[PDB]
Amino acid sequence: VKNSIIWFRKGLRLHDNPALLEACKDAKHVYPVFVLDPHFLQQKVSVNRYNFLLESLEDLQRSFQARGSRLLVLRGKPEEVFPRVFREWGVTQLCFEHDTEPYAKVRDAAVRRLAAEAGVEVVTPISHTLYDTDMLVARNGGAAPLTMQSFTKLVDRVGDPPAPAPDPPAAMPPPAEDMPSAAPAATGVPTWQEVGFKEPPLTVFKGGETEALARLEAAFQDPKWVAGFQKPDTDPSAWEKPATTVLSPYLKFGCLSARLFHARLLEVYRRHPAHSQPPVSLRGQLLWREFFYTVGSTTPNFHRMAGNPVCKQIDWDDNPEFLAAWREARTGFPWIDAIMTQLVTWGWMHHLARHSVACFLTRGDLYVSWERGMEVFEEHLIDQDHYLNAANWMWLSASAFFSQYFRVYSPVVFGKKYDPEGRFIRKFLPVLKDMPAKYIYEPWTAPLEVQRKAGCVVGRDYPAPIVDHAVASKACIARMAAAYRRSK
Numbered sequence: 350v351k352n353s354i355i356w357f358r359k360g361l362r363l364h365d366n367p368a369l370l371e372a373c374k375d376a377k378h379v380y381p382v383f384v385l386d387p388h389f390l391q392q393k394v395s396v397n398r399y400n401f402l403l404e405s406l407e408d409l410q411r412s413f414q415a416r417g418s419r420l421l422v423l424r425g426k427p428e429e430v431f432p433r434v435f436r437e438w439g440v441t442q443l444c445f446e447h448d449t450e451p452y453a454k455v456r457d458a459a460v461r462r463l464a465a466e467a468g469v470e471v472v473t474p475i476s477h478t479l480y481d482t483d484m485l486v487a488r489n490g491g492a493a494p495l496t497m498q499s500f501t502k503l504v505d506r507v508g509d510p511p512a513p514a515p516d517p518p519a520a521m522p523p524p525a526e527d528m529p530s531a532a533p534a535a536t537g538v539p540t541w542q543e544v545g546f547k548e549p550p551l552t553v554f555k556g557g558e559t560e561a562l563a564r565l566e567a568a569f570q571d572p573k574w575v576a577g578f579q580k581p582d583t584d585p586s587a588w589e590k591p592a593t594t595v596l597s598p599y600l601k602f603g604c605l606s607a608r609l610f611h612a613r614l615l616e617v618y619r620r621h622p623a624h625s626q627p628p629v630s631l632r633g634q635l636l637w638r639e640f641f642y643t644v645g646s647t648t649p650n651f652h653r654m655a656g657n658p659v660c661k662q663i664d665w666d667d668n669p670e671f672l673a674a675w676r677e678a679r680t681g682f683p684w685i686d687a688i689m690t691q692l693v694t695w696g697w698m699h700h701l702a703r704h705s706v707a708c709f710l711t712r713g714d715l716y717v718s719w720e721r722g723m724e725v726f727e728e729h730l731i732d733q734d735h736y737l738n739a740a741n742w743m744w745l746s747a748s749a750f751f752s753q754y755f756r757v758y759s760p761v762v763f764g765k766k767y768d769p770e771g772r773f774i775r776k777f778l779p780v781l782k783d784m785p786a787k788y789i790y791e792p793w794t795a796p797l798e799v800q801r802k803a804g805c806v807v808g809r810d811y812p813a814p815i816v817d818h819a820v821a822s823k824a825c826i827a828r829m830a831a832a833y834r835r836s837k
């Protein structure tokens with residue numbers, strides 16, 4: 350008889366899950382497993398992202414209960430848990446989605462070697478990305494494309510992505526009863542209070558496949574908006590209704606299928622011949638995701654500067670004061686401090702909002718290494734993706750993929766073009782809620798009478814700007830030019 354395990358790590362969904370379909374096919378018992386490390390708190394991670402993962406597991410649990418099954422949250426590490434449950438559950442086949450992250454490759458290798466010892470077949474379909482990213486490299490001659498212009502030419506010659514897999518059966522084979530490692534009191538989905546987190550989550554985006562599908566349908570309620578989508582024209586100061594899809598935390602955890610997303614975009618594009626094209630279109634945004642996965646997975650030390658071949662070695666400063674002020678949202682620039690406040694409260698910011706604070710920290714004003722900023726984003730971002738965060742940080746720091754270091758965003762002017770009243774600032778920085786719009790982006794320029802009228806005396810209620818942009822900008826640019834000449 351066939352008893353199988355469908356191992357969840359990413360791909361926290363039931364739709365377009367070929368690993369789940371193979372695990373259920375001709376199976377008497379199916380053990381849906383997510384492996385949790387309860388000492389992951391002795392190692393970094395905000396309660397916002399970890400609760401998003403927990404809500405995603407709860408959604409999977411309710412979805413499995415509706416089909417006569419159950420989600421098992423096994424505690425411990427994979428290398429110690431699987432050799433036990435292989436013999437206990439009579440497992441003959443192990444199934445999980447392919448992953449290309451460095452720790453995943455080291456982890457999945459040992460798991461496979463442990464399965465071959467137990468006589469367990471391992472099935473690992475590709476479903477987290479649009480294509481077999483190792484196939485794109487081989488199709489291109491054996492190296493990853495380093496520009497989006499050439500990558501888009503490759504995917505057009507490769508063809509349409511594989512279509513999404515059908516939905517699993519309305520009923521699935523349940524786990525066998527009275528198995529000790531399957532005891533419900535030891536395999537339930539924990540809450541954020543039981544894993545050690547002491548402060549509650551504040552983000553407004555809920556995890557789970559159900560929410561991922563609802564956000565997808567909501568974005569497709571207006572097909573003209575999807576067809577004419579242009580990423581650089583979207584509004585970074587929009588928070589009540591964000592200007593983009595906000596599907597990144599669901600695509601990160603695999604709550605939403607990228608191939609399903611891509612399949613729905615082609616349906617709209619076929620009936621809208623004037624639809625936007627890469628790199629600005631919605632489909633182009635998925636290609637940016639696939640692009641950085643293709644390069645990042647084939648580039649050693651991709652998340653670091655030293656040892657990274659595609660990354661420029663720049664003599665960034667070691668300034669713990671600029672990092673702390675930027676990290677704690679007290680730079681003195683309300684546009685920057687509001688975005689960093691949205692980071693710690695929501696775990697998500699608009700793409701151009703991240704451009705502002707990444708440029709401010711790195712090549713624009715403070716000249717701190719993008720590795721330091723990447724560490725801060727990885728902690729608070731609910732959509733933190735190993736390859737995407739690092740690639741866009743090297744982009745904004747002009748260390749890879751991007752070279753126009755003379756283009757420096759203004760922490761004073763950039764936001765005023767969209768939100769002249771500072772509604773985005775007043776929402777996240779409530780201490781500036783009564784400051785007139787003439788000085789909301791420059792509170793230090795307000796007369797002292799006006800500062801007292803608003804209850805925001807610069808230096809007492811809100812900090813003074815840690816740097817003068819005009820001076821700090823002309824100093825980072827000059828050092829970037831020197832770095833770019835010594836970069837050969």
Ligand SMILES: Cc1cc2nc3c(=O)[nH]c(=O)nc-3n(C[C@H](O)[C@H](O)[C@H](O)COP(=O)(O)OP(=O)(O)OC[C@H]3O[C@@H](n4cnc5c(N)ncnc54)[C@H](O)[C@@H]3O)c2cc1C
Nearest residue numbers: 593594595596597634635637638700703732733734738741
């Ligand atoms: C410094 C910096 C760090 C970033 N860190 C990450 C990260 O760790 N995780 C993350 O998901 N995004 C990250 N990005 C990308 C971008 O800011 C977000 O992907 C985007 O804002 C998410 O909003 P959305 O889902 O509405 O995007 P949409 O505009 O709706 O795009 C749709 C999807 O395409 C992908 N996508 C969009 N923009 C990019 C991009 N520039 N690069 C790669 N894929 C993209 C995402 O999967 C996104 O969900 C970062 C950007 C910056 C500037």
Ligand SMILES: [Cl-]
Nearest residue numbers: 758759762763
């Ligand atoms: Cl600007």
